[PDB]
Design a protein around this nucleic acid. Sequence first.
DNA 1: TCGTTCAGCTTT
DNA 2: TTTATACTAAGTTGGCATT
DNA 3: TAATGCCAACTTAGTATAAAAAAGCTGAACGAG
DNA 4: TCGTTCAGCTTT
DNA 5: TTTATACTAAGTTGGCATT
DNA 6: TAATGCCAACTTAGTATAAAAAAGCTGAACGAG
Lengths: 283, 273, 283, 273
Amino acid sequence: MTLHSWLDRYEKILASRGIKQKTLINYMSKIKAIRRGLPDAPLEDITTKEIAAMLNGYIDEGKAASAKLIRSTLSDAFREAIAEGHITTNHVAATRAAKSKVRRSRLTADEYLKIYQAAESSPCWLRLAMELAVVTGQRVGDLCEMKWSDIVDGYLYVEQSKTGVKIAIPTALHIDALGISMKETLDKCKEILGGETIIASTRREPLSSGTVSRYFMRARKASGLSFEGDPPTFHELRSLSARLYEKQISDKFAQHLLGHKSDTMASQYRDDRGREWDKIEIK
Amino acid sequence: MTLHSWLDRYEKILASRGIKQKTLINYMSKIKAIRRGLPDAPLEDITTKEIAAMLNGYIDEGKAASAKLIRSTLSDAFREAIAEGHITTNHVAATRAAKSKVRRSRLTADEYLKIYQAAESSPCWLRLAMELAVVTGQRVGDLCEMKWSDIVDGYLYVEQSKTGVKIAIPTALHIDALGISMKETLDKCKEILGGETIIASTRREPLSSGTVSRYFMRARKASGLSFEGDPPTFHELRSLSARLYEKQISDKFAQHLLGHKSDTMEWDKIEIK
Amino acid sequence: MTLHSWLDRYEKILASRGIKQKTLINYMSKIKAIRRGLPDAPLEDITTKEIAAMLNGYIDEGKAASAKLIRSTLSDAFREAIAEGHITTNHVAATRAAKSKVRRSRLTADEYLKIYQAAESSPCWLRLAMELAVVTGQRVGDLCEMKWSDIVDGYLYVEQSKTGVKIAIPTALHIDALGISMKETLDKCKEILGGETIIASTRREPLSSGTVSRYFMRARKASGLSFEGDPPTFHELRSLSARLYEKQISDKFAQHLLGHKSDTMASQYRDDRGREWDKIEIK
Amino acid sequence: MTLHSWLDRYEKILASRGIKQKTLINYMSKIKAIRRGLPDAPLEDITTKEIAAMLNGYIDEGKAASAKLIRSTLSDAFREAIAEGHITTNHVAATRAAKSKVRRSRLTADEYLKIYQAAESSPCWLRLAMELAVVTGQRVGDLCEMKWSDIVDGYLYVEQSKTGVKIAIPTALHIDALGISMKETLDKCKEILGGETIIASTRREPLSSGTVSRYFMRARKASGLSFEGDPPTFHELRSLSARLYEKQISDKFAQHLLGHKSDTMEWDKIEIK
DNA sequence: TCGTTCAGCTTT
DNA sequence: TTTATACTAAGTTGGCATT
DNA sequence: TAATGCCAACTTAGTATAAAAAAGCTGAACGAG
DNA sequence: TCGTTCAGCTTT
DNA sequence: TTTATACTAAGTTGGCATT
DNA sequence: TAATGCCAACTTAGTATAAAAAAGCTGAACGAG
């Protein structure tokens, strides 16, 4: 049939995949792009060349990431059109997914200390959010949803929203390199913040993970540090955590703590992407 | 030749397949849905487009589960047709399978107790069945056919109808959370129920599994409980059983009692090691 | 091109896959069958119907196993013809692999005892081969290649020929159910057999695993036992071993001993295929 | 347009790709093999049959490794052509990749020692390089560029040219099996070799990695040793290093020293548990 | 009888 | 070797029927 | 009556397989005793 | 300022 | 989530060349 | 001379990705102070 008409149908299909809200939002945005990019002509007649032209359009503006996702979504949409008997061949499969390297810079312990310090004039919860993150290795989304009720007998219970992974973290952790004590930290969060969520606003209410990430970014700018390519973000406290615990305790610990069943993912958080010189220990 | 003339030939093939009556019946029904869902056109002319159109018709009515099974069958009949070369291509293959999350809700020990209470208006066998179903964790079809002679020197022998699994359950088991003694439950059965089968109708004869199920369902409604997704069914007493024994004794045990030939059917403590 | 000509070419390809000798022998036999079964016509023109006809031919003689393998080999041969630009579509893929259930009957401990006893008038090594097999769970091929030099400090070292799996078996094993002691058994093999291979001939030479299997079969017939479908074979001492150790020690032990990384395989050796009633233990 | 007119366009694309000179050179060579292996016909007319024919030509000469890489490149150039729609289909895709087992043989500590002995007729730097290569486990290209200034407070800093990995090796390591002291080996280097790079030519200047390799190869022959499959090469001193450290210290350590961002590059004791 | 290889099948 | 899928054989329940 | 079955159209749930590779099984014919 | 949602991008 | 494959960037060495 | 490089055509070896799903990042515009 026709592309835009099929994309209308395609959305409905997604509405039935049982994917999470954020996932659907992401997909919708890719389709919207596909609508502006490609004509409303018979699917059978949409050429690899035309598809190629658009993607290159995004690649040329430096939006390789966007290109790669858009290409994926279109592709899958064709696979569904094929699965419903409209097309018969995937004109996208012949394309090559745009190759792009991660621009975001990793964060070194020192940088963390400068920022942590720069976050002086920031809402009291920032520093706390920061410490809790590095000492636990949990994503910010999960971080901001932890409730005091998830702590039972010295262990903090976490069910990662993104992966479903379940872990019990001992409140006895410590980041010797940064002088951070999980327990001491949770105690400052209990008094100074007091809320049902371990991390809370000045009004004792839970925060949106986007806000926490937003303030980290400001404190970062407030630090005056410079980086190659893109700046480190809040999420980077996760690899930092992994790399720090790596050298302090062990690979496996880092791997279990971050909730990485796979090694492809673990060896990735373990990478500093050239930020520093790895001083090899005879351990 | 034609779709329907073929569905006709296809049936007779299945009949020779060597499967159980129920399976065959399951198949026949899928075929009929196809008969009422597609034209009696030449196999060669039946489009993926058309097939999907039918398969979506079911999905739209939320009958995803059925869409999947009908698709499955359709493809099988087409393959058989290609074997006999009535066609060259299987147009069902390009179609995707509707994925569907089970909606049936689980049963918690508190609810069981609550349901057991509403059972009072029910025949006495409903309760004994429920109790027996949680303590022995067997399928309803297998419960309904247990005979007193299957018990020997403290063991209830069961050859599961669905999978052929053969097990010997020790008549000493006991569900702690619900206070059920397989010995006491069996005893009540022999004195109250009277018949050659452990579970038995008022007419002192074996009960149909469709009935046990149906009467439990009555009690469930009668209890007024509410659930998310579809309501728990008699078959859920088997999962409550699995889960309970899982904790009381062991996960390994829950498996052997239910009799799964696999391990196919959580919280990681992080040690500072 | 032409089928028989392509099959000639196809063999060469296999000669380059780096597969083991036995594997190549198996493949050759499937091709030979494909040669008798199908004409020497253009690949493009060999119909699913013709392919179907042959396979059904084998299925009707009760050689479902043969059908399924033959179908596989042909299929792969088409995939290679397709990969070299002769054909373009796999006329076999549309076929359905013949469905067949294992005919070989499992072996119960009692049956093992009757046979073991029946193997009285058998060469002294049989009984030994039998005990060593059940107490170790190793395949007969590996069994007959074990050298006294593979035992170091109470552990028997095994590198499975078929899988590459490596395990060190403690000479301290015991099959309480059959009254079999690995150590006692290895000792009888040392004196009574004396050879470089732990299992040896009356002339102190290694045996072919086919022979050991052959004598077990005779002792079996000599036992007078009857079975549904096909009789148990020597290999069945492996599942027996697994099922026995299952109830005596644990699932995992059985799983590690037999060298099964996967659970699909482990839960399979664990199955008795209806031979007996599984008396459930409260463990 | 035509295969060769395209290979021409294709090259300029690769040139803009942002890869290292050596990579680009690797690519150019594959292209030339293609130029001499296929007609300068219209892309549309180039068959899978033909491509395979060429790819097998290499396989037959036992150059499987090359067959694979040429195929890989060919497909990339075709994809780029489809992007610009000079074609609709990639006829390389249907072709399969030649799988090839590495034939190069490993190096054992006894052989290293034996080779080290034949090295006596070789420049003094060959030995120091060998020693340095086993104790530091770095790639030959990275060894040849180590400067004395990369050492600070007991650490040799290395930024691996191939992968960008940055490491600080402690100048206290020691290979037991071969009696090598990184401290003593470095010391011999400064007194005997003289130059800004730790390893250095007679002319007191940096050596090419192709040379170190080539002279080790000479010694290997000169030693008269024999191996299965191809003979071990200088790069094998890195594996001997990995393996030795694996046992002496730890597998984890062997990994960090070689600097692998992964764990990608045996005997299970059975406990009666 | 003790033992081995070739073949066409079945299992893992 | 293992995850997704194809086969199998249930179990669930509204309506109408048998006892 | 109530207590129970049976049909039918749905939804669940237990197992075996896929792919390739590499065994294992055992009738025959053969070799040294 | 403390905080939140919408969007179009980048990462995991 | 993970195994196979596509990209990258070496390293190996015979011949011929530079110093 | 020897000691070393350089080209070229091969063989090896280190990493990032695939697929889909589900985040995370942060400019804007907006809301209560």
